[PDB]
Backbone as numpy.savetxt, mean C-alpha at the origin, in Angstrom:
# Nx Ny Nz CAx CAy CAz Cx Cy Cz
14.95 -18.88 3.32 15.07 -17.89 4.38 13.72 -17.78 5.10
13.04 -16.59 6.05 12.26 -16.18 6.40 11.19 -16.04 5.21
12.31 -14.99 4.25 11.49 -14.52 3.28 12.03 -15.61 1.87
10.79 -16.11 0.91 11.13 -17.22 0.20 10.74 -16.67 -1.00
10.70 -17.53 -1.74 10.76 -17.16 -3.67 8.83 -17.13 -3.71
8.38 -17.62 -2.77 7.01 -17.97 -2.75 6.02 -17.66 -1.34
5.59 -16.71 -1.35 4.98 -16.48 0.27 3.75 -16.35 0.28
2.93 -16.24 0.93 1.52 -16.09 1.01 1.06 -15.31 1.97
0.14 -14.60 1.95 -0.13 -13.28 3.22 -1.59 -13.73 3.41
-2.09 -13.07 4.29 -3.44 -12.95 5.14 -3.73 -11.67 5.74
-4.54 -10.86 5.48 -5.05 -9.57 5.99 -6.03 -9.34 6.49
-5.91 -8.23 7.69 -7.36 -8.27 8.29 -7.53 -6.87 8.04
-8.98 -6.00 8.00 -9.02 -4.61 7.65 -10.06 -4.60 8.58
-10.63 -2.96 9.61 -11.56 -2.57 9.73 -10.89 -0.95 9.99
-12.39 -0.51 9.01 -11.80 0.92 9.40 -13.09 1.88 9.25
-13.73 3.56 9.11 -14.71 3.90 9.07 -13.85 4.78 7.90
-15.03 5.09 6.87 -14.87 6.64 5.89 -16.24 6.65 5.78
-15.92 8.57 6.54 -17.44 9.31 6.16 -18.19 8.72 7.12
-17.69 8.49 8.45 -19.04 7.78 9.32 -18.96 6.37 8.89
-18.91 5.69 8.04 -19.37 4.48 7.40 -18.68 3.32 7.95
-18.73 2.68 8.83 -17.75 1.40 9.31 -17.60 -0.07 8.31
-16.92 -0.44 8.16 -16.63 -1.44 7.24 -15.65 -2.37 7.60
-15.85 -3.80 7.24 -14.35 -4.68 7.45 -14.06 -5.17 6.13
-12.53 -5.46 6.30 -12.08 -6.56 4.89 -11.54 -7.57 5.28
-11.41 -8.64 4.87 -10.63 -9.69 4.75 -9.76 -9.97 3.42
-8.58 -10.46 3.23 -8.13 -11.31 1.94 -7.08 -11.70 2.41
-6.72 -12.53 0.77 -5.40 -13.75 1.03 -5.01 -13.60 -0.22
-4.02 -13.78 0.25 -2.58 -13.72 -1.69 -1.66 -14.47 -1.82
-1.12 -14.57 -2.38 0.30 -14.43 -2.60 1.27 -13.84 -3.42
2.83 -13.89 -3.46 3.06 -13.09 -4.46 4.98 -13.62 -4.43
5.62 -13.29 -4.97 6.73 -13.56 -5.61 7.99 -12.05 -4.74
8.40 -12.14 -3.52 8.89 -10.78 -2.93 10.07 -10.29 -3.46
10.52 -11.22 -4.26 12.46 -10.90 -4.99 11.98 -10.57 -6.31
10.48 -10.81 -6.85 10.38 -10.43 -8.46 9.43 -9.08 -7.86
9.44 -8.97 -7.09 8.30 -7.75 -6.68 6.89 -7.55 -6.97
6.28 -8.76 -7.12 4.80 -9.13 -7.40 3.70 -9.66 -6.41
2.79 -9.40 -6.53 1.84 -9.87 -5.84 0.11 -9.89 -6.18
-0.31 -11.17 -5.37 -1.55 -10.80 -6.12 -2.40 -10.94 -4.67
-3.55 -10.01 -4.75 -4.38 -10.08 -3.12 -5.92 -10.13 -3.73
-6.57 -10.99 -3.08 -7.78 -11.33 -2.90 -8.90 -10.81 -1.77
-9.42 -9.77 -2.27 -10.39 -9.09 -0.73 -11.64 -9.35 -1.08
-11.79 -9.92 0.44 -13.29 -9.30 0.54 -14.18 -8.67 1.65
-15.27 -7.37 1.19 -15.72 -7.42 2.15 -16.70 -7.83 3.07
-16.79 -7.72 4.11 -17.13 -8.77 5.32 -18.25 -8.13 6.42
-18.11 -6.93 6.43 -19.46 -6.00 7.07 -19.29 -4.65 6.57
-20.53 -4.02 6.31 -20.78 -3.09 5.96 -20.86 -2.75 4.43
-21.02 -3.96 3.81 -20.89 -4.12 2.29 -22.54 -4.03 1.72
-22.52 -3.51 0.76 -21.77 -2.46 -0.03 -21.38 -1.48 0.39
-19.95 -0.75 0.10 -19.62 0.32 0.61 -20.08 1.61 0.05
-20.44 2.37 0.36 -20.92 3.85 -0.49 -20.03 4.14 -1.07
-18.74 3.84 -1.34 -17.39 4.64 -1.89 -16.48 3.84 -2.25
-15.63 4.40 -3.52 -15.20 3.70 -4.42 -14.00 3.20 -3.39
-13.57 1.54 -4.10 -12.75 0.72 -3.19 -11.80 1.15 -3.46
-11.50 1.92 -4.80 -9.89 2.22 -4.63 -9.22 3.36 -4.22
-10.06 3.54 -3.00 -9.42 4.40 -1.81 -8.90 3.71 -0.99
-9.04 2.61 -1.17 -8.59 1.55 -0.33 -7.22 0.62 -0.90
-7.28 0.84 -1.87 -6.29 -0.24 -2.75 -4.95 -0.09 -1.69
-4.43 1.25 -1.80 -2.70 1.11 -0.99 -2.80 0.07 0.14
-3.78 0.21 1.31 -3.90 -0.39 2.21 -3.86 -1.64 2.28
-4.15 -2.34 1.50 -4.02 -4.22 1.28 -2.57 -4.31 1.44
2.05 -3.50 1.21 2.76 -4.79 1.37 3.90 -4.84 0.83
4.43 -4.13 1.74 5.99 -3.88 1.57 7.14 -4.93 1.40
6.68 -6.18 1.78 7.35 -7.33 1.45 7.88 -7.36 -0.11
6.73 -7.13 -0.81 6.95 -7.77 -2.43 7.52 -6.87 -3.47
8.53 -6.26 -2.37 9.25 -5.07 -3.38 10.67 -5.69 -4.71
10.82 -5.77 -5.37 11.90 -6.28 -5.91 13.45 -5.16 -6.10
13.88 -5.72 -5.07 15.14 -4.41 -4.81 16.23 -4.73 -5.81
16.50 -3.82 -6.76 17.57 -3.69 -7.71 18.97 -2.67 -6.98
20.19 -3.29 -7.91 20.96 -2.21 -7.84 21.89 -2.45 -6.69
21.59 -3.76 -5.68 21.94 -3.52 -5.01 21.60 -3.17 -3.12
20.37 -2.23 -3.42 19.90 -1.74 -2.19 19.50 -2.40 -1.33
20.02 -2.05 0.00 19.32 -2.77 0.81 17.93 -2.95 1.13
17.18 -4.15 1.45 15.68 -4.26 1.87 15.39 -4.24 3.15
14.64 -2.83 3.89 14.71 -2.26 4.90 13.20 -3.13 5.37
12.53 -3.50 4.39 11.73 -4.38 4.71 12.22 -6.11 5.12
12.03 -6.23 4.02 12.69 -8.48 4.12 13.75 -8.26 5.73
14.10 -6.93 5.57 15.51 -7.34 7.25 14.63 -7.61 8.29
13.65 -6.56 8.36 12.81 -6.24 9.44 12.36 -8.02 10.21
12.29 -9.13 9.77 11.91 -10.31 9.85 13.45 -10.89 10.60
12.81 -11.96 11.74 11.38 -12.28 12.45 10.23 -11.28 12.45
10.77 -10.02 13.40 9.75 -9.63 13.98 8.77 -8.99 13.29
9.23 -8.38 12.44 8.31 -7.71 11.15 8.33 -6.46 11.24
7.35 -5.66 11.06 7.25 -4.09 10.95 6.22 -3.93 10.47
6.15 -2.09 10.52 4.43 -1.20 10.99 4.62 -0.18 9.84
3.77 0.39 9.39 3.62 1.83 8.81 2.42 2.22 9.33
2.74 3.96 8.92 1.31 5.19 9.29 1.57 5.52 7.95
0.33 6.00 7.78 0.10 6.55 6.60 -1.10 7.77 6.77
-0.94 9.11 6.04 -1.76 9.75 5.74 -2.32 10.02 3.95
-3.17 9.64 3.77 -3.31 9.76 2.31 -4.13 11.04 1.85
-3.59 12.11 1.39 -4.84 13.73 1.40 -4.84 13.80 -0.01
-6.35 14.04 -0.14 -6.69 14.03 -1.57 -6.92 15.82 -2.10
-6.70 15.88 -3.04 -6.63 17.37 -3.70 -7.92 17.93 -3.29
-9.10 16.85 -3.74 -10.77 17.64 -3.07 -10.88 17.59 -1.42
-9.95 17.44 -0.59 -10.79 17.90 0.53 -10.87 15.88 1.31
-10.59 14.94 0.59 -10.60 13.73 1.37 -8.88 13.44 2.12
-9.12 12.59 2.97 -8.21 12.35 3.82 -7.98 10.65 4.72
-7.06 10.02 4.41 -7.46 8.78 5.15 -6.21 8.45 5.20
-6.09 8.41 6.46 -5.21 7.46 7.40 -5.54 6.34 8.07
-4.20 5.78 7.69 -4.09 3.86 7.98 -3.14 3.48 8.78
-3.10 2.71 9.33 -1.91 1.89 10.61 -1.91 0.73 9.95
-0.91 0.37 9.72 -0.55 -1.50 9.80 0.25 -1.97 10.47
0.16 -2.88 10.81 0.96 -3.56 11.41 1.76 -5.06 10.78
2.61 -5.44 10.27 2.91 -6.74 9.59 3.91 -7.58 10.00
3.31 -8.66 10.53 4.09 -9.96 11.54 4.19 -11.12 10.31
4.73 -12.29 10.99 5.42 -13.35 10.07 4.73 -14.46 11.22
3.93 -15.15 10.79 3.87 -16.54 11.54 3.43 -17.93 11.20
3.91 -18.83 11.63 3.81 -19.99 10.73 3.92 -20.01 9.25
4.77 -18.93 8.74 5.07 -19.07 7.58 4.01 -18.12 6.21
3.65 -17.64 7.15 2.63 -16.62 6.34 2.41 -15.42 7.08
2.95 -14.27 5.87 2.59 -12.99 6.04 1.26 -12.78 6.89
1.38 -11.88 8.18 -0.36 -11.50 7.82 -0.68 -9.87 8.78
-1.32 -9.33 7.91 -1.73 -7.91 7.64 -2.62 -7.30 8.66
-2.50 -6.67 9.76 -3.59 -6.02 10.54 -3.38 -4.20 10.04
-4.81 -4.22 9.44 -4.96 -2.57 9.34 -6.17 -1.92 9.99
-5.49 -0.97 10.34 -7.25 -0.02 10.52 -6.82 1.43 9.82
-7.83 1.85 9.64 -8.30 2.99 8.55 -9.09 4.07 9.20
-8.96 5.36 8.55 -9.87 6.35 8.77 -10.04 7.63 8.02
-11.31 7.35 6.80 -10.98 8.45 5.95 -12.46 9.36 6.67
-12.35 10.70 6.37 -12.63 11.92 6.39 -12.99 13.08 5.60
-14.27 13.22 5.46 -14.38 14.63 4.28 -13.95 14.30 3.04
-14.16 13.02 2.87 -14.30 12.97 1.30 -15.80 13.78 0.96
-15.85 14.51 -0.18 -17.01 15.38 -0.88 -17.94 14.91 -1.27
-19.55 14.94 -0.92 -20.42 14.03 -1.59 -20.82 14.24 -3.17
-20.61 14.89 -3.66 -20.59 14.85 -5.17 -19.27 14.73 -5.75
-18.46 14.37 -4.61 -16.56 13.92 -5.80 -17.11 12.55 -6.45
-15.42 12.07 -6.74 -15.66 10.65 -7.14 -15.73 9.58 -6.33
-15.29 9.45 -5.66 -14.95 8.81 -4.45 -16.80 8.58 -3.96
-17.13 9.31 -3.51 -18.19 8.92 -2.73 -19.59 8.56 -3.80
-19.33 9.23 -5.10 -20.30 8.99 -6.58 -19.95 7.89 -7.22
-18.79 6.96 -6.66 -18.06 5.98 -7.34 -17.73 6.15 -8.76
-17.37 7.26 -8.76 -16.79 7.47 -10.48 -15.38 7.36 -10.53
-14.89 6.74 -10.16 -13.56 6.18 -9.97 -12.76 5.07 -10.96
-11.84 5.16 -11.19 -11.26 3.81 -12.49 -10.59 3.03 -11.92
-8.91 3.33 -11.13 -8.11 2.71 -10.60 -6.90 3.46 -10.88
-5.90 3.11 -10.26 -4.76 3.98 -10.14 -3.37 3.72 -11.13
-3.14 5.16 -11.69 -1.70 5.00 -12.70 -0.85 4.58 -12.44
0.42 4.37 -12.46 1.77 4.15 -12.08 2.37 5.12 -11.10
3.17 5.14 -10.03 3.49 6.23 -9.51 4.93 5.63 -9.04
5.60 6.77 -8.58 6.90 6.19 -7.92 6.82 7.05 -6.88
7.44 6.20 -5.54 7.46 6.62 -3.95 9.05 7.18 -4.19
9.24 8.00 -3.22 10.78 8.39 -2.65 10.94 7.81 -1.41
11.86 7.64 -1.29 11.92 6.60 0.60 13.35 7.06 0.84
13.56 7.41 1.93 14.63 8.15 2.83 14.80 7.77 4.35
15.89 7.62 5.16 15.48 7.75 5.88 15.29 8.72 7.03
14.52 8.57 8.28 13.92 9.41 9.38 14.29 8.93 10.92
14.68 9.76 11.82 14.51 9.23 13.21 13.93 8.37 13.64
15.33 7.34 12.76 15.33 5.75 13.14 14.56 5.23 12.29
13.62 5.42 11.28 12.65 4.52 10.14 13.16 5.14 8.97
11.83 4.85 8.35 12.16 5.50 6.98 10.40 5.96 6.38
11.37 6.90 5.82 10.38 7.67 5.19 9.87 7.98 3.84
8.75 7.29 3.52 7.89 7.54 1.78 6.89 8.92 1.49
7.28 9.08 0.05 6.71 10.23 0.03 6.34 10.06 -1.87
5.08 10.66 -1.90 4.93 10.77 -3.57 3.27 11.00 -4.05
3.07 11.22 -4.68 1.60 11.30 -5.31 1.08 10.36 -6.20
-0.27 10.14 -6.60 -0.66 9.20 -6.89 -1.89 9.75 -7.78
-2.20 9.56 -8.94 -3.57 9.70 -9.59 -4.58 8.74 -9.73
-5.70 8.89 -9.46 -6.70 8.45 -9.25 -7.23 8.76 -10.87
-8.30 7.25 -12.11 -8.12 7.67 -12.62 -10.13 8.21 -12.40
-10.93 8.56 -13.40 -11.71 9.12 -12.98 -12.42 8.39 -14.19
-14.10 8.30 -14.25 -14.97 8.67 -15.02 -15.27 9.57 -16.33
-15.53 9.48 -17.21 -15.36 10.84 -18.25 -14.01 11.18 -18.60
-12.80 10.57 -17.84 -11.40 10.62 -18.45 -11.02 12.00 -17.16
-10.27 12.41 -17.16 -9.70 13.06 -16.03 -8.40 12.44 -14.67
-8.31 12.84 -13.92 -7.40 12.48 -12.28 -8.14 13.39 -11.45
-8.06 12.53 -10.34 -7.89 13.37 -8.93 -6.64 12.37 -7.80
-5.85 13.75 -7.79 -4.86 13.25 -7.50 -4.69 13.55 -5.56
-4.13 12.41 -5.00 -3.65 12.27 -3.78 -2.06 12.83 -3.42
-1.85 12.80 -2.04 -0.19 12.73 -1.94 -0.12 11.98 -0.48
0.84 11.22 -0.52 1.12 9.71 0.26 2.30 10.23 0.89
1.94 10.14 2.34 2.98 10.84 3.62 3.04 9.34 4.12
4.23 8.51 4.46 4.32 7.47 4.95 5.76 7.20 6.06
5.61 6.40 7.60 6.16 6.55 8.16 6.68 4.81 8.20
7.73 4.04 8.12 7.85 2.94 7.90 8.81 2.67 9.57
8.21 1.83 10.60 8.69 1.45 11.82 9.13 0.21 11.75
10.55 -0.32 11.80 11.03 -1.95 12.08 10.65 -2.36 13.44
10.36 -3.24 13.77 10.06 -3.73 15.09 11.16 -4.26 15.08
12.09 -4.96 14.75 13.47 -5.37 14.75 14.44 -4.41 15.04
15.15 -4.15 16.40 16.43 -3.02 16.42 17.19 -2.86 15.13
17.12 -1.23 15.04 17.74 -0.54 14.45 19.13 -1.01 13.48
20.20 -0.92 14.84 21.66 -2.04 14.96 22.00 -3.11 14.03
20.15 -3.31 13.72 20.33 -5.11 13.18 20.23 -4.77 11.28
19.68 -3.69 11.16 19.36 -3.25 9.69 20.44 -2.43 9.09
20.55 -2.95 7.74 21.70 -1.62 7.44 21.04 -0.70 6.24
20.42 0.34 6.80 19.72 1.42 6.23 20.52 1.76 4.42
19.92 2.59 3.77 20.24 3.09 2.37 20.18 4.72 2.67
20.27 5.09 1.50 20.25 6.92 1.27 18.69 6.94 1.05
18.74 7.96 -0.19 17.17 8.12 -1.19 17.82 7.48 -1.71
15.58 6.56 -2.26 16.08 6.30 -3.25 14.61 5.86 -3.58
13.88 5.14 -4.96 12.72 5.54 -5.21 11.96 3.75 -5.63
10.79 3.82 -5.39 10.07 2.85 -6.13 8.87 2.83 -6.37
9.24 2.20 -7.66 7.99 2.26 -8.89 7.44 1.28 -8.32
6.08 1.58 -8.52 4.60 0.94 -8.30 3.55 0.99 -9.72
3.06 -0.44 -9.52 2.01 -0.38 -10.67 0.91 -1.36 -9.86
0.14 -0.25 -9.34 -1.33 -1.58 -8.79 -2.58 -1.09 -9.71
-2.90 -2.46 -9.75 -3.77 -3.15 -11.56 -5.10 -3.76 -10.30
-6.44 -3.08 -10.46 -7.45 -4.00 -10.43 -7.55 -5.17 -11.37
-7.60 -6.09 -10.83 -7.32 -7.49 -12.14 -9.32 -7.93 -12.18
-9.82 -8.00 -11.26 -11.43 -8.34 -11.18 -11.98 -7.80 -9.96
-13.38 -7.52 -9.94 -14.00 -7.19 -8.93 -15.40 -8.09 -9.33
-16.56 -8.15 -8.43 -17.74 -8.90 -8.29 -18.58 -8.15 -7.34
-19.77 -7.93 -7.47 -21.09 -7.84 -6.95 -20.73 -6.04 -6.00
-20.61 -5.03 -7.04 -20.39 -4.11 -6.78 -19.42 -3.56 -6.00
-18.49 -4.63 -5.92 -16.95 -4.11 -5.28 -17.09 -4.49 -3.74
-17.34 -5.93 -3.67 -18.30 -6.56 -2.41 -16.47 -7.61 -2.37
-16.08 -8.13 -3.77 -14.95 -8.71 -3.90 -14.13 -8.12 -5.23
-12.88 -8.13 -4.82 -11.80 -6.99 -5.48 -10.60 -8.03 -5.58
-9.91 -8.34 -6.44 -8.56 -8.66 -6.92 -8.00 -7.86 -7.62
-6.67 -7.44 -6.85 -5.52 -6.61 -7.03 -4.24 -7.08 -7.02
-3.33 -7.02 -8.20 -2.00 -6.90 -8.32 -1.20 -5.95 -8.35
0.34 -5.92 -7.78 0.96 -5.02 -7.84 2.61 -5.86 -8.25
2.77 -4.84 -8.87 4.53 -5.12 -9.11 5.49 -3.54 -8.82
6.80 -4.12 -8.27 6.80 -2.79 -7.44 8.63 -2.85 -7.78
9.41 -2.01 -7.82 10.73 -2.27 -8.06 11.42 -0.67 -7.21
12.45 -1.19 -6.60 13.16 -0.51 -6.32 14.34 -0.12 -6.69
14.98 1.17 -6.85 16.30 1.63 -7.75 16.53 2.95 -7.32
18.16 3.30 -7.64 18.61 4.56 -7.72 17.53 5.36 -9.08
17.76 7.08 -8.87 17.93 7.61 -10.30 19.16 6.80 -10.89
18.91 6.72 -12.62 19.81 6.68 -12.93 20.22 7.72 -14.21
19.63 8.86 -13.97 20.14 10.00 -15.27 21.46 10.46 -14.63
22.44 10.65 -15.89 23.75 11.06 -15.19 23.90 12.57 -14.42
24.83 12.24 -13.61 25.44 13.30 -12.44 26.50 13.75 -12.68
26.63 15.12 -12.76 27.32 15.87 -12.48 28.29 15.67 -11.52
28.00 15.78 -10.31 28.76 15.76 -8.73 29.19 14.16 -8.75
């Protein structure tokens, strides 16, 4: 198909947090029917960053969801033309960062345009002290909205000294492909697990995996 047992992506990043301007680059690949992936970043100006990268992790891919059950993939349809998300990410201390992507298909490879903009992160949190670990398991809710669809869920950050500081993930998902052409779902939820696998020279280069599955609840119902 468009979308194959084997794909490969390309991403471009520039964005500012805290004043601070920065770019990324990376390349992956990943497995979109087993819901895996693996991404390779690096950054490219403004490196070292003052602040921990995995404020950044979501931002590196809706492709590599593995849809169970049945459900339709509001993503894989979206192709040729591809599709966009907004995102606001607000953190419990007072940080805030919003992202745009945009994600096209050409010559056979995924590839990723984002820009970023976080805000009032705290200079003695973790985030900006880099006391940061990497992120738990979480599951999104996705619904849909006037004409897209809509993600929603929280996320823990893990911390230094043992602890969370936890986020909540407002997400707006746009097909560039008419509406007409997709056949939308109800609610319904997916699990996420993104794993720092290696980093190098103070988080200058970052490898990240994710495996991601989509499904109904399935505790029994009443109605």
């Amino acid at each position: 198909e468009l979308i194959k047992e084997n794909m490969h992506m390309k991403l471009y990043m520039e964005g500012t947090v805290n004043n601070h301007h920065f770019k990324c680059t990376s390349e992956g690949e990943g497995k979109p029917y087993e819901g895996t992936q693996t991404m390779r970043i690096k950054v490219v100006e403004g490196g070292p960053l003052p602040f921990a990268f995995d404020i950044l992790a979501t931002s590196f891919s809706r492709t590599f969801i593995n849809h169970t059950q049945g459900i339709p993939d509001f993503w894989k349809q979206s192709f040729p033309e591809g599709f966009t998300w907004e995102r606001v990410t607000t953190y419990e201390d007072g940080g805030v960062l919003t992202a745009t992507q945009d994600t096209s298909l050409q010559d056979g490879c995924l590839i990723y345009n984002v820009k970023i903009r976080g805000v009032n992160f705290p200079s003695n949190g973790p985030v900006m002290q880099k006391k940061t670990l990497g992120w738990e398991a979480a599951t999104e809710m996705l619904y849909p909205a006037d004409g897209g669809l809509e993600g929603r869920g929280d996320m823990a950050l893990k911390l230094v000294g043992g602890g969370h500081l936890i986020c909540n993930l407002k997400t707006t998902y746009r097909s560039k492909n008419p509406a007409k052409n997709l056949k939308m779902p109800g609610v319904y939820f997916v699990d996420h697990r993104l794993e720092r696998i290696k980093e190098a020279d103070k988080e200058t280069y970052v490898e990240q995996h994710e495996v991601a599955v989509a499904r109904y609840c399935d505790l029994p119902s009443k109605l």
